[PDB]
Write an enzyme that holds these catalytic residues in place. Structure first.
Site, PDB file in Angstrom:
ATOM      1  N   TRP A  54       0.854  -1.216   0.000  1.00  0.00           N
ATOM      2  CA  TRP A  54       0.000   0.000   0.000  1.00  0.00           C
ATOM      3  C   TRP A  54       0.865   1.232   0.000  1.00  0.00           C
ATOM      4  CZ3 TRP A  54      -2.736  -3.398  -1.625  1.00  0.00           C
ATOM      5  CH2 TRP A  54      -3.894  -3.954  -1.058  1.00  0.00           C
ATOM      6  N   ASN A 166      -6.448   0.254  -4.834  1.00  0.00           N
ATOM      7  CA  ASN A 166      -6.712  -1.145  -4.505  1.00  0.00           C
ATOM      8  C   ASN A 166      -8.181  -1.449  -4.675  1.00  0.00           C
ATOM      9  OD1 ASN A 166      -6.193  -3.782  -3.530  1.00  0.00           O
ATOM     10  ND2 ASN A 166      -7.336  -3.185  -1.692  1.00  0.00           N
ATOM     11  N   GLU A 167      -8.489  -2.300  -5.679  1.00  0.00           N
ATOM     12  CA  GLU A 167      -9.849  -2.853  -5.912  1.00  0.00           C
ATOM     13  C   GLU A 167     -10.938  -1.801  -6.061  1.00  0.00           C
ATOM     14  OE1 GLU A 167     -10.211  -5.960  -2.771  1.00  0.00           O
ATOM     15  OE2 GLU A 167      -9.150  -7.284  -4.142  1.00  0.00           O
ATOM     16  N   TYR A 242     -10.928 -14.452  -5.389  1.00  0.00           N
ATOM     17  CA  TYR A 242     -11.448 -14.920  -4.068  1.00  0.00           C
ATOM     18  C   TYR A 242     -12.764 -15.663  -4.160  1.00  0.00           C
ATOM     19  CZ  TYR A 242      -7.729 -11.918  -2.207  1.00  0.00           C
ATOM     20  OH  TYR A 242      -6.564 -11.309  -1.898  1.00  0.00           O
ATOM     21  N   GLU A 275      -3.825 -10.597  -7.057  1.00  0.00           N
ATOM     22  CA  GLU A 275      -4.140 -11.152  -5.708  1.00  0.00           C
ATOM     23  C   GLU A 275      -4.894 -12.454  -5.957  1.00  0.00           C
ATOM     24  OE1 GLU A 275      -6.446  -8.889  -2.974  1.00  0.00           O
ATOM     25  OE2 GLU A 275      -5.449  -6.979  -3.363  1.00  0.00           O
ATOM     26  N   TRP A 305      -1.865 -13.364  -2.410  1.00  0.00           N
ATOM     27  CA  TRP A 305      -2.234 -12.595  -1.221  1.00  0.00           C
ATOM     28  C   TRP A 305      -2.177 -13.575  -0.053  1.00  0.00           C
ATOM     29  CZ3 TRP A 305      -3.217  -7.494  -0.242  1.00  0.00           C
ATOM     30  CH2 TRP A 305      -3.640  -7.179   1.045  1.00  0.00           C
TER      31      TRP A 305
END
Ligand SMILES: *[C@@H]1O[C@H](CO)[C@@H](O)[C@H](O)[C@H]1NC(C)=O
Length: 341
Positions: A54, A166-167, A242, A275, A305
């Protein structure tokens, strides 16, 4: 020579190759240099060429003494922290990456509320998590933050890529919201730094190519993967994975990699499988995904991740996905794997 692209491949120091990496979101939030060095040396000796960290840490109130933060967003004003418990920690990470043959992906805001994110900008500037993209006060602060960070490492060969967020999502938004934001923000970055790679950081949602009909391929989270990848100022695609969090079976994962690789190929740009994780049966399940990624045209690199290690402060964060250095899952998914590439 900075990291780059050549057709569907990534390059480092001007040489193409498939690269394995990891995520260590917390690396620039440590306050002990020896621990930064340990993590990056452990990554280096294991063959991890890329580490995603990050590049943001947004707060709405000033944290306790000793706690790292990069930007205070409060009552309509942004104050960037360039001191010893601010962006100087990211400076040490970039320096350490240069000393450890690691290239960094550095992103500039979270979608999520962790470490502030788009919610912390909403608290400071008004609006909503969907209006953020087009809200003047937020976007001005965001861009100023981007320029502040990019300018620190503009000449560093240890930056793999600048990453918008991020995302990022825009739930229920027309896909043009994110697309115009990607184009504008990435052009902004390239106006400052013409030489490093730029990518989005999205999960890869919104894809017609090779869809299985499941929700991740839909466009209702605001992103259109092929549309955005066509932006001339984006150099490579990102996607995440995920299954259980997303309401799908693990059998969706390899086809998700195949579908993104096809999309990347179609765009003429590499994909980073940026990820992925499960909380059990990691070796088997993630190993399958890893093999697909190596076998798929257009997948240029992958990063699981997340990295784990033993620090002077204790174990690094365990969110159930963490794969710790020295464990069997690390041998399976890192050291064995990288050696076999
Ligand atoms: C996604 O972008 C593709 C272009 O890459 C376009 O053909 C398709 O219509 C877009 N769909 C949505 C819902 O944005």
């Amino acid at each position: 020579t900075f990291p780059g692209t050549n057709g569907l491949d990534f390059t480092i120091d001007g040489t193409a190759g498939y690269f394995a990496g990891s995520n260590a979101y917390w690396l620039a939030f440590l306050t002990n240099n020896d621990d930064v060095d340990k993590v990056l040396g452990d990554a280096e000796s294991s063959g991890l060429r890329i580490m995603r960290v990050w590049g943001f840490n947004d707060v709405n109130t000033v944290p306790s003494s000793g706690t790292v933060y990069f930007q205070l967003l409060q009552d309509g004003t942004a104050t960037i922290n360039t001191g010893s418990d601010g962006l100087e920690r990211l400076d040490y990470v970039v320096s350490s990456a240069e000393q450890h043959n690691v290239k960094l992906i550095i992103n500039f805001v979270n979608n999520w509320s962790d470490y502030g994110g788009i919610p912390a900008y909403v608290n400071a500037f008004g609006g909503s998590t969907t209006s953020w993209y087009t809200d003047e006060a937020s976007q001005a602060a965001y861009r100023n933050y981007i320029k502040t960070v990019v300018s620190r490492y503009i000449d560093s060969p240890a930056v793999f890529a600048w990453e918008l967020a991020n995302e990022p999502r825009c739930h229920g938004c027309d896909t043009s919201v994110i697309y115009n934001w990607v184009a504008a923000t990435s052009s902004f970055i390239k106006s400052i730094d013409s030489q490093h790679l730029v990518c989005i950081g999205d999960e890869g949602l919104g894809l017609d190519i090779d869809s299985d009909g499941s929700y991740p391929y839909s466009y209702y989270e605001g992103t259109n993967f092929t549309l955005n990848l066509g932006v001339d100022t984006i150099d490579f695609g990102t996607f995440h994975l995920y299954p259980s969090s997303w309401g799908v079976s693990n059998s969706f994962g390899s086809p998700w990699v195949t579908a993104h690789g096809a999309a990347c190929a179609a765009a003429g740009k590499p994909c980073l499988f940026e990820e992925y994780g499960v909380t059990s049966d990691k070796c088997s399940v993630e190993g399958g995904w890893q093999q697909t990624a190596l076998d798929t045209r257009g997948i240029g690199a992958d990063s699981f991740w997340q990295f784990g290690d033993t620090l002077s402060t204790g174990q690094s964060p365990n969110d159930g996905y963490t794969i710790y250095y020295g464990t069997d899952d690390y041998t399976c998914l890192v050291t064995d794997r990288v050696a076999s590439i």
